[PDB]
Design a protein around this ligand. Sequence first.
Ligand SMILES: [Cl-]
Ligand SMILES: [Cl-]
Length: 162
Amino acid sequence: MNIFEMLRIDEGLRLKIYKDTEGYYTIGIGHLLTKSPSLNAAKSELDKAIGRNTNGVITKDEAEKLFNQDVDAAVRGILRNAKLKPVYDSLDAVRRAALMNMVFQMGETGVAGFTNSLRMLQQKRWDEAAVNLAKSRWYNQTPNRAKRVITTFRTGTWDAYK
Ligand SMILES: [Cl-]
Ligand SMILES: [Cl-]
């Protein structure tokens, strides 16, 4: 298992524009197009991202390419963020994948706001962090996915995804 497979599981794969759990227009493997309520705006962002007139539909290859870019961006966002980098540097490989999953879902800024949980992860206080992470809107809104990521930080293994 790895980051790509893990996210592919959590996000799924859709080839036509769709609305995510927050009702925003998305496509592919969790690639957020826009927060605006306009479908046209979404088709516009889509074409600009793919580089052709898509008409709201993309191929598998195109989805994958977006996904690759998004994963890379996530790492790099981690590494440039002063509250995140240090955490990431302290963790082992499986747990780094759990931090990336969260950044991919909620953005760098959203995760950096889990100050207290971050501190706990840095200290390697697994159970405590797991409890603190669950006291969040993130957990109450997408509880199954959040449980998977949380178990991942708690245990340092991929069991939740096997
Ligand atoms: Cl893009
Ligand atoms: Cl969920």
